[PDB]
Amino acid sequence: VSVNLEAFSQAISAIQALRSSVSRVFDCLKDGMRNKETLEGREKAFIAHFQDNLHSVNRDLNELERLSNLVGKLYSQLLQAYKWSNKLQYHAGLASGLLNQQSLKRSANQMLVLPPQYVDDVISRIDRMFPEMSIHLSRPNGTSAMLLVTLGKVLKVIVVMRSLFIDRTIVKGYNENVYTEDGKLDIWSKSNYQVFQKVTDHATTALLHYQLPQMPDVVVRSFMTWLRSYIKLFQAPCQRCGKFLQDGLPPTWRDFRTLEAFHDTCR
Amino acid sequence: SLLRPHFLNTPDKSPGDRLTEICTKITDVDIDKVMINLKTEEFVLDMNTLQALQQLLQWVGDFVLYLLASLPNLRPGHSFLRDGTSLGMLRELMVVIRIWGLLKPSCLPVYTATSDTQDSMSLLFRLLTKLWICCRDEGPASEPDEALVDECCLLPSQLLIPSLDWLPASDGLVSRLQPKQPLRLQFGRAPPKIDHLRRLHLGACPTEECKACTRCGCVTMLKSPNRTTAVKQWEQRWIKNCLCGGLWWRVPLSYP
Ligand SMILES: [Zn+2]
Ligand SMILES: [Zn+2]
């Protein structure tokens, strides 16, 4: 497992540090006291350097002992290709991140139509991960798919798509009846509580925020990733004021790209 | 000069001359056989100055070892390999070092030996006698035989040849000058640190202040380190001059 890899590389650097620090002790003692103007000042400098070197040796030995407490347990062509594959994969990950952070594309111009089967395959692929979210697709009105995403015992989100691109979302509480009299989805309602109206507003900013132009799978996957973080409503405190309640509201803002809780008044 | 004979046996020869006669007639390769015939109750000191002589005896042993290891190869020792008189002097000092080591073992030079069943002083004395018998011949100029060459090739294996400081650290102008070209100097601009006379290793940046000789360039620290244990027979020779003759001249501290 990877923790053994990290502990072994850690303890490798611990041995190298121990050896170099012992040699540094004996090298600084080889040179002897320097001059340093004031006699009192030169004595102080020599004593301080020797003490620091000894302390560093002790720290390195202690760290090696701590890793010891925590440690657990033609053919060359294949390994060369394996190493070069991992190298290319990591290199490409870094270069792709650096380049798509800073794109120079200004306009798409130079000089939506999808089978519903594809939408069902995509959304079932999202439903297979996140075992606490269940997504139930239905199409009461044409090709525009409507999704009920239940989330723990916490949320019921009604997502109204339009050609495999999220359009509207409505977040209601668990007990709340999301069905009309006839058992269809109540696409147009609100949720009787202050908290879930705030989370509808935050979800509309979430669907306005996660916008790739072309590829919509990253959009729906990232929206569900962000939505999954709301399972710690009523349990997470705000990361600005520490408390749970500002004006009788839990922290309704799970921040994009770092899913942390905030009261929206604490931005 | 230091050995004061406690009683005069075989008079009309001072113990320097008795030692030189005995070391020049006894050509034995062992150090014990030379040391036996030398009246060794005469070679006695008070075991205080005898201990304080440690650094000069260290230079003697280190120079002998450097010279013998330098034999297989123009270097800082090339003249001494063929001078019979200086090798005789080095023999005599090794014999009196052996006697003084038997009186007190702390006066001896130290050699980092790559073996523990070794008598390093006797090894160097064996090689020194075998080199010196080459040159103590009358009208000789005997080139050294191959047995000595391979034995002195084995010396870096058996002991570690340390390093040595060679005195004329040349900053004199006369080597630097040329006819028809004058040096244009500024005042005060001036276009492994040892004390060369008492063989003490100063640090990287030395804390105690120093004199420098104005001709050779040797450095000594200004006041003696231990005023109680000081071999004043050696320190009081160089009060007014260096050994080369030039004057002392106080050097300023670095303060880096
Ligand atoms: Zn807050
Ligand atoms: Zn001089």
UniProtKB/Swiss-Prot annotation, chain A:
It is found in: Nucleus. Component of the Mediator complex, which is composed of MED1, MED4, MED6, MED7, MED8, MED9, MED10, MED11, MED12, MED13, MED13L, MED14, MED15, MED16, MED17, MED18, MED19, MED20, MED21, MED22, MED23, MED24, MED25, MED26, MED27, MED29, MED30, MED31, CCNC, CDK8 and CDC2L6/CDK11. The MED12, MED13, CCNC and CDK8 subunits form a distinct module termed the CDK8 module. Mediator containing the CDK8 module is less active than Mediator lacking this module in supporting transcriptional activation. The modification Phosphoserine is found at S103. This is Mediator of RNA polymerase II transcription subunit 27. It comes from the Eukaryota. Changing G248S: In NEDSCAC; uncertain significance. GO terms for molecular function: transcription coactivator activity; ubiquitin protein ligase activity. Pfam families: Med27. Component of the Mediator complex, a coactivator involved in the regulated transcription of nearly all RNA polymerase II-dependent genes. Mediator functions as a bridge to convey information from gene-specific regulatory proteins to the basal RNA polymerase II transcription machinery. Mediator is recruited to promoters by direct interactions with regulatory proteins and serves as a scaffold for the assembly of a functional preinitiation complex with RNA polymerase II and the general transcription factors. PANTHER family: 34 KDA TRANSCRIPTIONAL CO-ACTIVATOR-RELATED, MEDIATOR OF RNA POLYMERASE II TRANSCRIPTION SUBUNIT 27. Changing V199A: In NEDSCAC; uncertain significance. Changing P216L: In NEDSCAC; uncertain significance. It is linked to Neurodevelopmental disorder with spasticity, cataracts, and cerebellar hypoplasia: An autosomal recessive disorder characterized by global developmental delay, impaired intellectual development, and poor or absent speech. More severely affected individuals do not achieve independent ambulation, whereas others develop some speech and can walk, or show regression later in childhood. Additional features include axial hypotonia, peripheral spasticity, dystonia, cataracts, and seizures. Brain imaging usually shows cerebellar hypoplasia, thin corpus callosum, cerebral atrophy, and hypomyelination. GO terms for biological process: positive regulation of transcription elongation by RNA polymerase II; positive regulation of transcription initiation by RNA polymerase II; protein ubiquitination; regulation of transcription by RNA polymerase II; RNA polymerase II preinitiation complex assembly; somatic stem cell population maintenance; transcription initiation at RNA polymerase II promoter. Belongs to the Mediator complex subunit 27 family. Keywords: Activator, Cataract, Intellectual disability, Methylation, Nucleus, Phosphoprotein, Transcription, Transcription regulation. The gene is MED27. Its main location: nucleus. The modification N6-methyllysine is found at K105.
UniProtKB/Swiss-Prot annotation, chain B:
It comes from the Eukaryota. It is found in: Nucleus. Belongs to the Mediator complex subunit 16 family. Component of the Mediator complex, which is composed of MED1, MED4, MED6, MED7, MED8, MED9, MED10, MED11, MED12, MED13, MED13L, MED14, MED15, MED16, MED17, MED18, MED19, MED20, MED21, MED22, MED23, MED24, MED25, MED26, MED27, MED29, MED30, MED31, CCNC, CDK8 and CDC2L6/CDK11. The MED12, MED13, CCNC and CDK8 subunits form a distinct module termed the CDK8 module. Mediator containing the CDK8 module is less active than Mediator lacking this module in supporting transcriptional activation. Component of the Mediator complex, a coactivator involved in the regulated transcription of nearly all RNA polymerase II-dependent genes. Mediator functions as a bridge to convey information from gene-specific regulatory proteins to the basal RNA polymerase II transcription machinery. Mediator is recruited to promoters by direct interactions with regulatory proteins and serves as a scaffold for the assembly of a functional preinitiation complex with RNA polymerase II and the general transcription factors. This is Mediator of RNA polymerase II transcription subunit 16. It comes from Homo sapiens. The lineage of its organism: Eukaryota, Metazoa, Chordata, Craniata, Vertebrata.
